[PDB]
Amino acid sequence: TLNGGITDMLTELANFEKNVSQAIHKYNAYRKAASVIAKYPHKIKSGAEAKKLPGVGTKIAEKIDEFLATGKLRKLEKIRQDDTSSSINFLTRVSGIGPSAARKFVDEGIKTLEDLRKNEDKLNHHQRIGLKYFGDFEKRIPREEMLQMQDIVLNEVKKVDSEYIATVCGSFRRGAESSGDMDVLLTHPSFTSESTKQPKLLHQVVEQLQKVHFITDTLSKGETKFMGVCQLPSKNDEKEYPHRRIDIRLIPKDQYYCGVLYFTGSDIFNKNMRAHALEKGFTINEYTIRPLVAGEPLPVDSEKDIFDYIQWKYREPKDRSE
DNA sequence: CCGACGCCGCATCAGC
DNA sequence: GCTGATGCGG
DNA sequence: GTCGG
Ligand SMILES: Nc1ccn([C@H]2C[C@H](O)[C@@H](COP(=O)(O)OP(=O)(O)OP(=O)(O)O)O2)c(=O)n1
Ligand SMILES: [Ca+2]
Ligand SMILES: [Ca+2]
Secondary structure, rough: OHHHHHOOOHHHHHHHHHOOOOOOHHHHHHHHHHHHHHOOOOOOOOOOHHHHHOOOOOHHHHHHHHHHHHHHOOHHHHHOHHHHHHHHHHHHHHOOOOOOHHHHHHHOOOOOHHHHHHOOHHHOHHHHHHOOOOOHOOOOOOOHHHHHHHHHHHHHHHHHHHOEEEEEOOOHOOOOOOOOOOOOEEEEEEEOOOOOOOOOOHHHOOOOOOOOEEEEEEEEEOEEEEEEEEEEOOOOOOOOOEEEEEEEOOOOHHHHHHHHHHHHHHHHHHHHHHHHHHOOEEEOOOOOEOOOOOOOOOOOOHHHHHHHHHHHOOOOOHHHHO
């Protein structure tokens, strides 16, 4: 939080470019600026000092200059004043509603939560779930709760089949005190890059998590990715825990280290590493690291090996929260 | 100046 | 039905 | 919006 106001300002410009303008690359630009400024270990004294970092260029320089002078950003004060921009922005905070649906909705008269509550009629299933739990999903999850959740997921996965390994990734594996949601990497002997020895491997686990009422809703569900809704059980008389987003990814077992690297993130860490891969002549996805169009996967025994390939020192999870 | 901006699963759509 | 594009979120 | 070449 040394430059919290600067990174906040850049975050919300990024939000605006993603949601309103539908300018995915200006969203990445702004969020890369924000990232590199968030780990800079001095209080930024000027836009000139700021432009010295990679990803801060001329235009963000001038806006950093404006913001320290005055403590605000005209471009943003007027983006907050526009009734249409501020409502499309709000709609995208509903899970399942993005920049396209958000804009379409306001074009139909729909711009408040109340309008959504009246017109669940007009929402696909995901967006209905996103609405249903809109306030819960706005909440963060304390690491203590994450721990209870992980003890449930892992104990229930062991009951299905003992050869399953479940790993919780995301911000939790990076050691954050609070997570936005839960992310579970699953492996099983029967599923490698080479064959799929059994069906329903993901199904069986979700099924069991539904049986004991841990999983409450399904946003989407395929062979290898599950995105749904879970909730901790609560004791007699107590208020109910908030419902929480959960993602399970079944990754072939010999590609664990590429899966856990992907899934540990952060998003911006993933993007910078894969874009640095591209400069060393590689491409990393969540299954393989292949040389460069892609050739054959190179052998991977550990997360560090992926780092060793693109000529990076190893970075423990805790240090990947960019 | 200018390409090129990380990589992908699932849902949905239009075209067939 | 598929295939590819598009949307969305990981 | 930024940047390397
Ligand atoms: N655009 C994205 C989004 C996510 N991920 C990867 C890295 C993330 O860490 C992981 C999980 O997505 P999350 O949104 O849950 O990211 P976090 O766990 O880091 O943040 P939060 O504490 O909000 O849950 O998937 C990615 O590679 N690219
Ligand atoms: Ca998460
Ligand atoms: Ca997640």
